[PDB]
Amino acid sequence: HGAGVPHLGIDPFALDYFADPYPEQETLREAGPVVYLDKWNVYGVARYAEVYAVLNDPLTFCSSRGVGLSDFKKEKPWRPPSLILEADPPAHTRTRAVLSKVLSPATMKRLRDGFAAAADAKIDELLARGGNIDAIADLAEAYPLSVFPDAMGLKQEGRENLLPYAGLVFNAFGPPNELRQSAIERSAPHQAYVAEQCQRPNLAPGGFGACIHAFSDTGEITPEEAPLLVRSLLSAGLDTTVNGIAAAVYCLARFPDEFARLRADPSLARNAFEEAVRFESPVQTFFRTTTRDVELAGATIGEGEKVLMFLGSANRDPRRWDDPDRYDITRKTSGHVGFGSGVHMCVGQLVARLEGEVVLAALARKVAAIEIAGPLKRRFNNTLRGLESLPIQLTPA
Ligand code: HEM
Numbered sequence: 001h002g003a004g005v006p007h008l009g010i011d012p013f014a015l016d017y018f019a020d021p022y023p024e025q026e027t028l029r030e031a032g033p034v035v036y037l038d039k040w041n042v043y044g045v046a047r048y049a050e051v052y053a054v055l056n057d058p059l060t061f062c063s064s065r066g067v068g069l070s071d072f073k074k075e076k077p078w079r080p081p082s083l084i085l086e087a088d089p090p091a092h093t094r095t096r097a098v099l100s101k102v103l104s105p106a107t108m109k110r111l112r113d114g115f116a117a118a119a120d121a122k123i124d125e126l127l128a129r130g131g132n133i134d135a136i137a138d139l140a141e142a143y144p145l146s147v148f149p150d151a152m153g154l155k156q157e158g159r160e161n162l163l164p165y166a167g168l169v170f171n172a173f174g175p176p177n178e179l180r181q182s183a184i185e186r187s188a189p190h191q192a193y194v195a196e197q198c199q200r201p202n203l204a205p206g207g208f209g210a211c212i213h214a215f216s217d218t219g220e221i222t223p224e225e226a227p228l229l230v231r232s233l234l235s236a237g238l239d240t241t242v243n244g245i246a247a248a249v250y251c252l253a254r255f256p257d258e259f260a261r262l263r264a265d266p267s268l269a270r271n272a273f274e275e276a277v278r279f280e281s282p283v284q285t286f287f288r289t290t291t292r293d294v295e296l297a298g299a300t301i302g303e304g305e306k307v308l309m310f311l312g313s314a315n316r317d318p319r320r321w322d323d324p325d326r327y328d329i330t331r332k333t334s335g336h337v338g339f340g341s342g343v344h345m346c347v348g349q350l351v352a353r354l355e356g357e358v359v360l361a362a363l364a365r366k367v368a369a370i371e372i373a374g375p376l377k378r379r380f381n382n383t384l385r386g387l388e389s390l391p392i393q394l395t396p397a
Contacts, residue, residue: 002036033297061288131394153207166238174382243386247280273356277338
């Protein structure tokens with residue numbers, strides 16, 4: 001295995017790596033376009049060129065064998081494969097089409113005012129207590145926990161267990177380590193509870209959930225698939241959105257001159273969030289599995305091989321980005337892989353962007369200055385990058 005390519009001892013699932021990932025991500029890029037990780041016996045690609053290429057060759061680098069370390073072809077799935085994320089065309093085309101229609105631009109346009117109003121109120125609220133708050137619990141998590149479940153049609157009370165439930169999702173794409181084991185145990189007590197809220201009788205009319213269920217009535221999807229697709233949105237959208245808003249606030253808080261540009265021109269809100277996604281990519285990695293013997297950037301990769309993609313690294317590859325390590329809210333961000341690329345490119349990106357834009361717009365208008373006011377605590381996850389705590393001080397406009 002790994003014949004003809006550079007072998008490395010880098011551990012992409014170690015907490016030491018998660019705590020300070022950039023130096024090693026650079027090592028991965030400089031070693032070659034294709035490397036082999038001896039600690040896990042899997043191939044890896046960290047440059048923008050190859051990551052983009054692989055993501056856009058869904059036939060060759062499939063997702064139906066799992067986007068995690070396990071090969072669902074060779075091994076009986078230890079967890080049920082996602083009917084959307086871990087499906088290849090044409091199956092994927094069918095379930096994707098439903099979600100794509102439900103999370104359309106027209107839908108976002110209808111939700112915009114409500115999302116903005118909630119954002120403005122949240123910021124006024126935070127300022128009222130004083131600027132001294134935790135950007136994670138009080139904003140990165142609080143804001144989406146309000147508007148996202150609302151748009152989904154989930155009940156108002158008991159949202160306290162959505163994150164505990166959602167923590168399993170992306171950790172499950174990693175090996176059976178302590179992070180994985182802890183997320184499973186933390187999620188267990190809420191599994192049945194959250195699944196129940198995704199059944200048709202429990203969804204508020206008009207929300208994402210109810211609209212998805214309507215597709216059961218026509219035949220596009222079965223009554224059994226419907227609640228699973230609904231739950232997939234929650235799973236795929238909670239930690240990612242929290243980490244996304246967290247990254248944007250973290251970036252603007254650490255680089256005051258960029259927040260100054262934003263305040264001077266609030267219309268940069270959407271791009272400041274997009275740049276935050278490129279710079280501090282919520283979804284750092286995940287796998288694809290080869291379905292045939294292939295040639296990739298000079299390397300020979302056999303069929304049935306797991307390939308680990310580093311989206312964060314691709315988003316900071318100097319071969320593609322000028323001054324990659326600089327957070328620039330006016331940067332031309334088009335092309336970054338923070339939401340992936342190709343047939344699987346985040347079907348929920350418009351929702352995520354709406355939320356992010358709206359939060360940063362409220363900040364740009366209501367806050368005069370932002371500063372980190374205490375020790376930062378990073379949230380460790382097998383495939384995601386995020387913060388557990390970020391004390392900051394918001395100065396009123
Ligand atoms: C900052 C926010 C977000 C980021 C950075 C993000 C990133 C991603 C990435 C990188 C993928 C690709 C996985 C692959 O190719 O295997 C993905 C897929 C997906 N995401 Fe997002 N995500 C975000 C928010 C959301 C939200 C809020 C939702 C729910 C509305 C969501 C629903 C999905 C779904 C359903 C897929 C699978 C699409 C398919 O397989 O066709 N995501 N996301």
